[PDB]
Amino acid sequence: VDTMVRESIVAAIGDNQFAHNKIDSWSNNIVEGCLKRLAAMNKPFKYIVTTNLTQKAGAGLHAASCARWNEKTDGKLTVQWENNTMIVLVSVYWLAV
């Protein structure tokens, strides 16, 4: 489910380089791309999609996300990507209806 997302991300921003004024824009396109990736699966759920992108500048970081949800129907899926100067994180969250 997320492997096609990862291949989409490696297709979109593979080995590319930072430019800050379109960085958010890439995020938007990624969010739209992942939206189509959600719209291809269309499981009847409440979906949440989020991206993060950050320059490799030399500060150490740690990241994850949590909630307090109905544990059997609500879930999280993720893809981390990186290159020489950038880090990319995409997250999808399932809440049931």
Place this chain on the structure above:
Amino acid sequence: HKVQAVLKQVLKERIEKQKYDPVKGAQISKQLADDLREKVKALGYDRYKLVIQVTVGQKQGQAMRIISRCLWDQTNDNFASEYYENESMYCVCQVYGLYY
């Protein structure tokens, strides 16, 4: 927002007199995230949930911004952002107030 103001109060109440530290930072950031979760999951919970993001950084003064593009169920999912800085710690919080 009242809740946002008290979440920023929680941010300071964590990080006052402090500086960002690589060695304290795993436990410090776990305490940060869990304390903001405990804030939003205290009184003020009415069959909701909160989805959380936290960023903590050292002070260098380059060009940095935040943005987030989502798709959500519209009437039940809301969002807010918080920024703060001090002598050595930048801290940003992103809160997603969603119906459980």
